[PDB]
Amino acid sequence: SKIIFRLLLNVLMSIIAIISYQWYEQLGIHLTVAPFSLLGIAIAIFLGFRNSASYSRFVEARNLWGTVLIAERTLVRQLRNILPAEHDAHRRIVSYLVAFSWSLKHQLRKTDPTADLRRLLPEERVTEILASSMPTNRILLLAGNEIGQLREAGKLSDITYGLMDNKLDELAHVLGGCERLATTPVPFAYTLILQRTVYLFCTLLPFALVGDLHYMTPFVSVFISYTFLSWDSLAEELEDPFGTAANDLPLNAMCNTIERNLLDMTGQ
Amino acid sequence: SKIIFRLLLNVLMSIIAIISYQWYEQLGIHLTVAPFSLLGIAIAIFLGFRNSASYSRFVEARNLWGTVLIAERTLVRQLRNILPAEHDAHRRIVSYLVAFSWSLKHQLRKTDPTADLRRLLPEERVTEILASSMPTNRILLLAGNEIGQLREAGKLSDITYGLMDNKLDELAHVLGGCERLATTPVPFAYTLILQRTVYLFCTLLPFALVGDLHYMTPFVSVFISYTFLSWDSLAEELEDPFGTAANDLPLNAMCNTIERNLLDMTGQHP
Amino acid sequence: KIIFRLLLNVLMSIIAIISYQWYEQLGIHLTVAPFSLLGIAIAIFLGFRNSASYSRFVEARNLWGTVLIAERTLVRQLRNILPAEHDAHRRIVSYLVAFSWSLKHQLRKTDPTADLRRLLPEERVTEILASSMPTNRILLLAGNEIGQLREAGKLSDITYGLMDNKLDELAHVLGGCERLATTPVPFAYTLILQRTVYLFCTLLPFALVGDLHYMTPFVSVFISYTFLSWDSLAEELEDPFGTAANDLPLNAMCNTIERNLLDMTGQHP
Amino acid sequence: SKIIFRLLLNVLMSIIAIISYQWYEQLGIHLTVAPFSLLGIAIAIFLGFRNSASYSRFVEARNLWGTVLIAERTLVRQLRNILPAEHDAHRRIVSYLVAFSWSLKHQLRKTDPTADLRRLLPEERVTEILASSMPTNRILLLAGNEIGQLREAGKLSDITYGLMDNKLDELAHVLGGCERLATTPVPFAYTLILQRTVYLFCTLLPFALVGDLHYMTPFVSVFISYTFLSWDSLAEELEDPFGTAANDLPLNAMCNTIERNLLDMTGQ
Amino acid sequence: IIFRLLLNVLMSIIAIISYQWYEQLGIHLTVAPFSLLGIAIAIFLGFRNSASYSRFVEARNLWGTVLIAERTLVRQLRNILPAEHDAHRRIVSYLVAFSWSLKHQLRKTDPTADLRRLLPEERVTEILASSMPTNRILLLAGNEIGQLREAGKLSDITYGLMDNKLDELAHVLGGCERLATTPVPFAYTLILQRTVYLFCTLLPFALVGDLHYMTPFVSVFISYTFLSWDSLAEELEDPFGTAANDLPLNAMCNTIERNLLDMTGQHPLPE
Ligand SMILES: [Cl-]
Ligand SMILES: [Cl-]
Ligand SMILES: [Cl-]
Ligand SMILES: [Cl-]
Ligand SMILES: [Cl-]
Ligand SMILES: [Cl-]
Ligand SMILES: [Cl-]
Ligand SMILES: [Cl-]
Ligand SMILES: [Cl-]
Ligand SMILES: [Cl-]
Ligand SMILES: [Cl-]
Ligand SMILES: [Zn+2]
Ligand SMILES: [Zn+2]
Ligand SMILES: [Zn+2]
Ligand SMILES: [Zn+2]
Ligand SMILES: [Zn+2]
Ligand SMILES: [Zn+2]
Ligand SMILES: [Zn+2]
Ligand SMILES: [Zn+2]
Ligand SMILES: [Zn+2]
Ligand SMILES: [Zn+2]
Ligand SMILES: [Zn+2]
Ligand SMILES: [Zn+2]
Ligand SMILES: [Zn+2]
Ligand SMILES: [Zn+2]
Ligand SMILES: [Zn+2]
């Protein structure tokens, strides 16, 4: 995306570097390569470790979404295996489950869940849900009432209620996990420290290479900038896993997979 | 080897650098190693981390398949332990669990499961399964009906129902975990340019190496190219552990083992 | 701060420039290759060290996230299981809110008396303040609420246990934070590092000056910034319960917790 | 100490380079160290990550056996605390649990468990175990039958029956884990590639240092080589956790510790 | 470690005065080779100290679980059997006994005084008879729970809730046992420790060509960095070693004891 602008600036920096090499020692400035080896290696080590942290936050995101599909699938399986006649509670619980997924998606994307929710629930409760500052948690509490009701109506025992309650728990952990990843980012000092350092390193590098490489510094220094810049750029494509880029999590696709999955297990 | 063809190319590029080395002065070419020491160390550091990430995908994928064997082994044990006489149920349930494994392998290899399914289940069921968006998930839900039936029949209590129920949860987690590794590759950005910049570094390397090595240049360049290139491609191999490469997982062996286990001696037990 | 030692590195480099006149006069040589070696080694160690510091930070944030999850689902279980017992709802929630603030005060080594008094009867405040661990005692109090529900027959051993597990989870959160605070790594991790990172940074100009001459301070400031930036960010991340910049907004996280629990039990602050 | 061969071949590889030295430049061949630092470092990085995998695998094998001891300790405890009257059942379950460990060791070493089985169990049960294609697994089935019938005899509720069933689940995870470790080495491509490069690098190296070290080539090129080889040999020393070499897991001693523990807990 | 630092300044002054005679013979020490060697040792020290750190972290987690399990077990006892203070005090004894006994076991020191202060000498003899005393303390703790269950004061459900806490301690015992027996590397740590030791002493000879009278200064700055990093992995590799820091294990056995007496109103002193 935005890297091409910074490598062409690096080509001109090299042109500026060759056209300026004659005036060099007259001013009194000597740039060997060896301290830039030190610096560049150092920057690579820190870039490597940072990029590690970023990949890990991306996979934790993806795991958290995998749990939603896992936990919702087995909740519905448990409903059918334990209460195979009660298709009325099936449809209601399933719609709260599908609501929860879509609501979680919209919450992380900071978008509006009204249509998805009205598509799935009566305005009777859709207003109760959006009346809360924590709508997705409220959907869980409502799904909780459903199994709670089947327990008090004697159709669930304490045991079988507990078996399903634990899947609510699993969805609660997904909710908190997602919220935690969304609010708490990879500390901003990483991008600030490394974006400066990397950008300044690629810019100062030609003036250090020209002593030894002469007319060829434009090439090998755009090379070195390319790998540093794109390694660094891939960290930022991974640190916001809930964003919209094609390189991010296809959250719409996953919510669709979830809905068709639960609607499949219900015969719809 | 995708490496054997490139390795030779690097030999030629190495030949070109030595024949046309003293001519550097005419065209205006100086080329030190130190900029390529730096560049190459950075690429090693990044190769190392990427390879680390791919092995993690390998071991998780191995692990997830490990749990199928475990969870199925113990669900059959619980049936033999709690309903020792219910052999028609034992037989029915084992067939679904063996279907689960083969079905999952096919799902992850994008191959057809119909042959394996019919080998193991009634054809009415082979069509209920093949009809679904997710057949592995349906095989699970049918396995859960069998123990759900024994529970309506009073043969299982809620407690012992839950004990067997938890093993089906365990398999749902394998299914989900396997889809996550399938459905999401690692970002192709990683693959898109990390493999080109390794090649690029590899071919240019002799052009900066000759001045110090002279004749010894084709050897040392191909050595360096070997290590960097085998590392990069091994990483891309283990990234797709449900693939069919030589270092991917033996999914077919593993389903065989699962099958042989659950049908150990006609499915007969003490 | 960090900007002070950056400045002194600019000083140390002009000291190098002026006393370069006298280098082999006094009998002095300083190539850069040895400092490249030392420099890279320190980079590697800073790389690993820093990675462990981030891991502690993520764990602390994760632990606090579990407070919210567990407390949410405890209130959820109370409402689904005992929809009528609103006094218990109110008392448990006031304990679970007391737990969060008391944990914040614990981790910050501050007095929890104000927040406790806001939230609970003074006879309980005194009980909680007497304990070598107020958060532990608050969990026990919460545990008596559901336990008394259980003696009265309103909870079964099963549904009592479902809720007990949540208190178990908070216990684990308590120990996890206790363990992250009560365990600074042996001071070797920092006086190997921030001593050597400091020392390396200010000797680097003397070694850089033969190659670079008047340029010394610029590269020397760049290398020193890079190393110092990395090394200081490590020190912030490893005390995540402190008051520094990159440290958990524990008061915000508590307010979110209280508001969530007030939300689920129909109350408006 | 399979390693002292290549250290000494290195010493003579440096002497060959000492004598062949000035035949170089009209032969024309030159070797500086700079490109070998590049390679040497790149290999050190790859050696580091590989040894890392090799170490995690040894730790997992040690963990797995560790929890055999944990889960059988606590399963025997539960039997004491819940059925203190029933020392006959105590002694049967303990022999199955001791048998499981021995059988799991034999399995992993591919040795005959028959003598150990016949020392712990009635020959009727030995016959059933050895008839299975998965003897260790079939030992768990038999142990589960013990507690299974204590359940049908009403001496265990479903609750306490389930408390002990979970310990058999834990042993099931040990068995599968060990089988998995046993058949899933660190991929061969790893150690295959490193050995070709680490070995080739260690012999070519003195050729590239005599130009700089002259007469001291051996003492420095051997010291560099001991370092890569001993680091790469640590991987070999950690590759078969279940074998019988000195650096492998003392599985016999662990199996004796397990038996000793379970007999301390039942007064034998 | 400081002794090996001052052997390095010696080796440096040797390398200065003897640099004269060196190449009358023809012995060269450049710096590029020792740079390649030192970076590789730095890299391996990086991964080694990573492994060591993880062993140290797992050790602190296991001990943390002791405090967690023992707190929640005693909380469970109070919330579920509020009246049974005699049982409260017996079980708290075993839990506290278990902590000190685990610590003594790990540091191979004598548990007898801690045991004789916490439990009756009939149970001290029983515990001290076993070859696995910490396990025997868990088994004893189990009997207390089991008797409450046979007396019908615990249901199988609520008996089971407390049983899980004992498993948690069982897991801690085994984990700690495994982290003790081990070094997982079978004494290679001695090979790679003296590899740092030798590199640090040949280093001033490789540096004197470039640095002359300055080499003792740059050579030991480097050596301090490498030796401190090594000795630190040595400290973390062995979190129960017979020359470790006992402050936190003692601190933890004291915290849990104090917590438990607090939780059972044996603190504070009555009015
Ligand atoms: Cl689940
Ligand atoms: Cl299992
Ligand atoms: Cl929860
Ligand atoms: Cl256990
Ligand atoms: Cl007995
Ligand atoms: Cl399990
Ligand atoms: Cl071996
Ligand atoms: Cl006994
Ligand atoms: Cl606990
Ligand atoms: Cl008491
Ligand atoms: Cl009390
Ligand atoms: Zn689950
Ligand atoms: Zn239905
Ligand atoms: Zn209806
Ligand atoms: Zn709107
Ligand atoms: Zn399992
Ligand atoms: Zn059968
Ligand atoms: Zn030539
Ligand atoms: Zn939870
Ligand atoms: Zn209420
Ligand atoms: Zn366990
Ligand atoms: Zn007995
Ligand atoms: Zn072996
Ligand atoms: Zn716990
Ligand atoms: Zn009491
Ligand atoms: Zn006290």
Residue numbers in the entry:
A (entry chain D), D (entry chain A): 22 to 289
B (entry chain B): 22 to 291
C (entry chain C): 23 to 291
E (entry chain E): 24 to 294
Show me the paper's own sentences about this structure.
Alanine substitution mutants for each of the 12 residues were generated in KpBest and hBest1 and subjected to crystallography and patch clamp, respectively. Moreover, the equivalent KpBest mutants (W16A, G18A, S19A, L259A, P262A, G264A, and D269A) all showed an overall similar structure to that of WT KpBest. The corresponding “Ca2+-binding” sites in WT KpBest are occupied by Zn2+, an essential component in the crystallization buffer. Notably, the short extracellular domains of hBest1 represent a challenge for quantitative measurement of the surface expression by labeling techniques (e.g., biotin). They can be classified into three groups by different molecular mechanisms: (1) mutations on residues involved in Ca2+ binding, including W24A, G26A, S27A, L294A, P297A, F298A, G299A, and D304A, likely cause defects of Ca2+-dependent activation; (2) mutations at the neck/aperture, including I205A, I205T, 3A, and 4A, increase open probability by functionally mimicking a constant open state; and (3) mutations outside of the neck/aperture, including D203A, P233A, Y236A, Y236C, W287A, and W287F, alter open probability through the neck/aperture residues.
Human bestrophin1 (hBest1) is a Ca2+-activated Cl− channel essential for Cl− transport in retinal pigment epithelium (RPE). Although the structure of hBest1 is still unsolved, two Best1 homolog structures, one from bacteria Klebsiella pneumoniae (KpBest) and the other from chicken (cBest1), have been previously reported. Overall, the channel is a pentameric assembly with a single ion-conducting pathway, which varies in diameter along its length and is constrained at two narrow points: a “neck” contributed by three residues (I62/I66/F70 in KpBest and I76/F80/F84 in hBest1/cBest1) on a transmembrane helix, and an “aperture” formed by a single residue (I180 in KpBest1, I205 in hBest1, and V205 in cBest1) on a cytosolic helix. Here, by electrophysiological and structural analyses, we show that the neck and aperture in hBest1 are both indispensable Ca2+-dependent gates, and their dysregulated opening by rationally designed or patient-derived mutations causes Ca2+-independent leak and elevates Ca2+-dependent channel activity.
